[PDB]
Design a binder for these strands. Structure first.
Ligand SMILES: [Mg+2]
Ligand SMILES: [Mg+2]
Ligand SMILES: [Mg+2]
Ligand SMILES: [Mg+2]
Lengths: 362, 135, 46
RNA sequence: GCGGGGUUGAGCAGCCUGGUAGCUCGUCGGGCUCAUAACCCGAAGAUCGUCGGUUCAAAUCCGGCCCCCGCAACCA
């Protein structure tokens, strides 16, 4: 029962942590007010509002209820722990253990939900690591970071794959892309996106000065490349008409030229290269298709750009961790967790930071 | 005259979230019904839902008679299972004995529409089957 | 909380990366108190 | 429609009358250097676009399909 006791001890702590991250009291309050609103009969006259409210409530309730359960179950276990120990009734002890297991599972589920809420959080990811402005030192730092990440992934269970790597001409790596396969790999790693700040005395400096180099990690999920579906005949408007200049009676009469147009987009493609109307149409059609693709790509680009801009707006806040190896302290800047075992962290003990980050939702 | 069965567990006094507008749709107040329920409850047991007749007269002091607790909940209790409906024939989630079912049946005999308890038992069995559990 | 005005213009592909190749995340090397870049003409209180 | 092509990571050979995978760069491991480049030594690496066929046997011969590069696509 020593292990069991230990587990029990842990679980309370875990629960507390969860509560802290959740902001449990606030949630409870929200649930209360929402519940009250629901109870009031005037809310269901406006349909859109009411459903939304209902949606809001339920999740909150679940969050609160689960927490409450966690409080109780542990207590029960503790109570029954005594029985297991002193009174020496076996069945009762077993029951207690079972309860604990169930409770633990429940807790895990809630925490899992909290952590991996995003759409692509289940998928595999591409970790991209890029060295900073320093030079050799920066490159070295980047390399170290990469190594750490690899160590982490392996520990987790994930399958790493060095897709591309640019090496530093002296030492370290200039840049590297790593495919990290496994379940909830993106959701586990997405938090590590950001700028990482090393501080240490440079071995590559002849002066041996303290250097503060930066290096970026950037985790993005493997999105499925959706197929480019062909446009419909209903969406297109197809003119045919005479061509410019040319030569003859036949040419004057016949309507070989073809102008295809998208009704949704207002794009057009003409063609009158060929004599054959059909050929022209085919060419024109192809052109139209190409144009649509280009428009889709443009759209994709624009959206991406917006996101990039938004990210930039955070600025100095893109710096997520601080690895001080002179004074031997790692600090995560957003969550605030610290550790003096820098070496260990480097080797790949990021769980402490990562988990916290996940809990936070940052 | 506004009679409908619509309520959650008995111990939860004044169900604001689940029922809410439904019980206080007609002229009768929110306080009264809840109070009545509470009064009813203490004679037996909490935790389980219980249905009751809601004949809302013009005077507002409504007449009411309790019914037996629902069957499904009872079945669940008997089982010691929470969810046992998903994919019933493809893989059996839960299972119950006939004797237990029979025992369960006899306790609801006041409200149950039958003289022969055998019939009641078989009904219960059928209900259980419907849920997902194989007898 | 004020916005950092980066020197990258219009960021297209990746923001963080762009930032990294920016003055904000430039390398900082400390002045030596003893050693190479160490000589001080005048003290802090000289 | 008529030709030419797809061969180690890149650019080129062989295909020339079927059976032998070569050149230059690049990659990897050593060296030289305080270190990096250059330089030196030693290695690795190819279902020959794909799918069928002919053969004892196919990069090589024949055909189909996908992709590229020329050309020609006219007299109304
Ligand atoms: Mg070539
Ligand atoms: Mg030969
Ligand atoms: Mg051969
Ligand atoms: Mg060298």
């Amino acid at each position: 029962i020593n292990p069991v006791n230990n587990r029990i001890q842990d679980l309370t702590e875990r629960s507390d942590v969860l509560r802290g991250y959740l902001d449990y009291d606030a949630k409870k309050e929200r649930l209360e007010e929402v519940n009250a609103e629901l109870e009031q009969p005037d809310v269901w006259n406006e349909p859109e509002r009411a459903q939304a409210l209902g949606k809001e409530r339920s999740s909150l309730e679940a969050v609160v209820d689960t927490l409450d359960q966690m409080k109780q179950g542990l207590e029960d276990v503790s109570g029954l722990l005594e029985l297991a120990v002193e009174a020496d009734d076996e069945e009762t002890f077993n029951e207690a253990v079972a309860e604990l297991d169930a409770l633990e599972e429940k807790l895990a589920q809630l925490e899992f939900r909290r952590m991996f809420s995003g759409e692509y959080d289940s998928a595999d990811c591409y970790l991209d690591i890029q060295a900073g402005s320093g030079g050799t030192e920066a490159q070295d730092w980047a390399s170290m970071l990469e190594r750490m990440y690899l160590r982490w992934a392996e520990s987790r269970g994930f399958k790493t794959e060095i897709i591309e790597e640019s090496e530093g001409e002296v030492a370290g790596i200039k840049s590297v892309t790593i495919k990290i396969s496994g379940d909830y790999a993106y959701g586990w790693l997405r938090t590590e996106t950001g700028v990482h700040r090393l501080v240490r005395k440079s071995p590559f400096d002849s002066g041996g000065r303290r250097h503060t180099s930066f290096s970026s990690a950037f985790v993005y999920p493997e999105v499925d490349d959706d197929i480019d579906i062909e446009i419909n005949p209903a969406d297109l408007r197809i003119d045919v008409y005479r061509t410019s200049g040319a030569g003859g009676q036949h040419v004057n009469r016949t309507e070989s030229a073809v102008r295809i147009t998208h009704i949704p987009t207002g794009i057009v493609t003409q063609c009158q290269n060929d004599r054959s109307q059909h050929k022209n149409k085919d060419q024109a059609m192809k052109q139209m298709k190409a144009k649509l693709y280009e428009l889709e790509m443009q759209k994709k680009n624009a959206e991406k750009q917006a996101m990039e801009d938004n990210k930039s707006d955070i600025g100095w806040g893109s710096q997520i961790r601080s690895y001080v190896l002179d004074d031997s302290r790692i600090k995560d800047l957003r969550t605030g967790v610290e550790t003096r075992n820098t070496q260990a962290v480097l080797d790949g003990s990021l769980d402490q930071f990562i988990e916290a980050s996940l809990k936070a939702g940052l | 005259q506004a009679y409908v069965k619509l309520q959650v567990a008995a111990g939860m006094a004044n169900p604001s979230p689940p029922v809410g507008p439904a019980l206080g749709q007609q002229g009768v107040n929110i306080m009264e019904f809840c109070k009545a329920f509470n009064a009813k409850t203490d004679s037996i047991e909490k935790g389980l839902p219980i249905p009751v007749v809601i004949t809302v007269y013009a005077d507002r002091s409504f007449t009411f008679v309790t019914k037996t607790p629902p069957a499904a909940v009872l079945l669940k209790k008997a089982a010691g299972i929470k969810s046992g409906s998903g994919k019933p024939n493809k893989d059996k989630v839960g299972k119950i004995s006939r004797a237990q079912l029979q025992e369960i049946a006899q306790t609801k005999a006041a409200d149950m529409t039958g003289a022969d308890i055998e019939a009641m038992t078989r009904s219960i069995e059928g209900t259980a089957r419907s849920m997902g559990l194989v007898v | 909380m004020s916005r950092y005005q980066h020197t990258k213009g219009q960021i297209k592909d990746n923001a963080i990366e762009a930032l990294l190749h920016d003055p904000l995340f430039r390398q900082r090397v400390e002045k030596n108190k003893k050693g190479k870049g160490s000589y001080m003409r005048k003290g802090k209180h000289g």
